[PDB]
Amino acid sequence: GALKRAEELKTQANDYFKAKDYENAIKFYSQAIELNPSNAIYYGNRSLAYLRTECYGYALGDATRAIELDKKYIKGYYRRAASNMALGKFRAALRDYETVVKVKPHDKDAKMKYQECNKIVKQKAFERAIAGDEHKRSVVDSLDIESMTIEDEYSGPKLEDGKVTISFMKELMQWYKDQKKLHRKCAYQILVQVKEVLSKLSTLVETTLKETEKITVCGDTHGQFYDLLNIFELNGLPSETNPYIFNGDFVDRGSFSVEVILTLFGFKLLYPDHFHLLRGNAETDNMNQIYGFEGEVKAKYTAQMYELFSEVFEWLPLAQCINGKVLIMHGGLFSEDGVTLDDIRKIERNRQPPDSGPMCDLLWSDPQPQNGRSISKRGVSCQFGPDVTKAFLEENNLDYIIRSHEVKAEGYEVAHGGRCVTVFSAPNYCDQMGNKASYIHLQGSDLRPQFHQFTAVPH
């Protein structure tokens, strides 16, 4: 019978395993199984070579086979437990080890390994008990939208969790011509959906503009919708044929600012691919307080609305890159020329911007004429002339940078050795400039900033 050579094969293979000749052990073990498909011992010792070589997939397999093949192979359960510990299968390891020890009390024991299993599972159970830190109950838990309490005092259409109809959005723009506001359940429901989409968008936005396609780019709005009312009506409504990019600064000041983000966040749901919103540099709780936006919210709504707006706002991106050739930022240049695109993808959102590092280079850098580099203040470490940008633009293959921090006479300027440009949406921004405004027009075939001149001055 074939057992005569299976004995030699298993013997030679155990001797190869002891001699660290693992391939030869596995081959002669396989051959011993080829002569006896059902000896549980062969699958047992074969699984031990698969512990030793970390060939764990067949440690698990052949340990299971050894035990299925003989339910009374006690030392098979023991070797399965050895596989389980190597691999973290702790409950199975306890049960296998318990059985073995009660059957075989010893001094060079299975029981030190059982006590290691005991000590490990004891601490892991304690850790499962003291564990909070799955702690993220939602701002809107108990689903405040489905509490009904609908009013329609505004005669407002129902706005579903599906994309807000353009017809209402046109009506909403009319509700701003008429100083009229959304109902609360719809407003909560859009803020929930806005969170859900925005929190998944990349922290640096990447878009390819085809040669035949043109983008209109927008800057600081100071929370006045009148200017965007007009550009949407003037340059085409922000539909798929008007893939606008907005350089933030909406809660920059409060005047219609709730109403501004409330419409922008409406349009963002209907055309998310075409309509792109960045965070502005005057935008944190610190300024939401100073310019009374927090008060507008607390006047129009109970304070939990401000917690939801905080959550929603915290997901805004800082930057966008067009074709890998034009980079849109708020403030200006990075503290060093070595800043690398995947390292920008590794910037951590769900925090306030710092006064140092890439996030307040992006928001509070502030480009100069003169060559070099500034020192830490103003939400910052550094601000710049041309020289670092020559070397930065060479890393990433960029042409020039877009900024929105500073007012300029025609609504824009091309500056910084010709390697940077200005834009913003509000004409007569402040006590500080009575500027005209403009929108940059960019073609995939021609990225030299082209402009729309905006003289429609509110106030």
Binding site: K119, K122, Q123, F126, A129, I130
Partner: peptide
């Protein structure tokens, strides 16, 4: 849970520091 204070908060915390020591395996 019900809003009562403890007559002495130390005995209560000691029961906690014992469970913590057993859970960690300190003693």
């Amino acid at each position: 849970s019900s809003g009562f204070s403890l007559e002495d908060p130390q005995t209560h915390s000691n029961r906690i520091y014992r469970m913590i020591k057993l859970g960690l395996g300190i003693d």
